[PDB]
Amino acid sequence: IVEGSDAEIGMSPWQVMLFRKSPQELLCGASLISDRWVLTAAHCLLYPPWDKNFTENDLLVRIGKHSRTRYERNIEKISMLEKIYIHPRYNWRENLDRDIALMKLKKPVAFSDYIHPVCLPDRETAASLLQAGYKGRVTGWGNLKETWGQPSVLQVVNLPIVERPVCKDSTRIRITDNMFCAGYKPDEGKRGDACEGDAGGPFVMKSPFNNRWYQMGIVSWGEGCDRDGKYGFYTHVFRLKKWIQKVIDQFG
């Protein structure tokens, strides 16, 4: 997360860290969506150009975490995967279209002060909150700046949704209806973006109707991090809700 600040404890209790312990690395963020399911970006788990092809045993999911580099004995939950489901039309070759994956946990988790699932949007919530200029929140332990620079503690930034014609004009890459973009325009002055190591993490919005937090997006890609005239791209969760429901229906 670039130009954000430290999360307060328990501010984002659906935040999941995808972590390998040997070699020791933060792979990605992710989100808890029920007692047994975790949502992430497909490229966190499958990206052939970088020899990335994780199966259930290559990965541990860490829930309830605040520190990046410290085992938090009395707050965190470590779960193991039973199954990985990558979206069938995920496009790693071109533009990361449908960059989404589900992970089924081996045992259900119990919720706590620090561990709680985020809501998925219904039609009205998705429609009414996902409007240009409306702000959502992105969190993660990824890079504090574009580099080829990591935080100790979970980072958070609030960012406005951008009009689609502006998202289209910002980039040479073919973008789809399964993506939205967020961040400040050049003449809006303000700064902020997600970055490497934040992928799979949730873009969330708080509904004024019921005071619940909803996940609208999944950190997917960008061109560098926090550049003028460039925006972060996010997997459009509502657009892909049918698939999520189908997977949880079929295999849950």
């Binding site: 970006a41 490229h43 990206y47 150009p49 071109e94 533009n95 990361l96 990824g142 040479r172 890459i173 997600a194 970055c195 490497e196 190591g197 934040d198 992928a199 950190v219 997917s220 890609w221 960008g222 061109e223 560098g224 972060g232």
Partner: peptide
Amino acid sequence: QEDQVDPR
């Protein structure tokens, strides 16, 4: 290595 898209 960059084919324009930078995955996060």
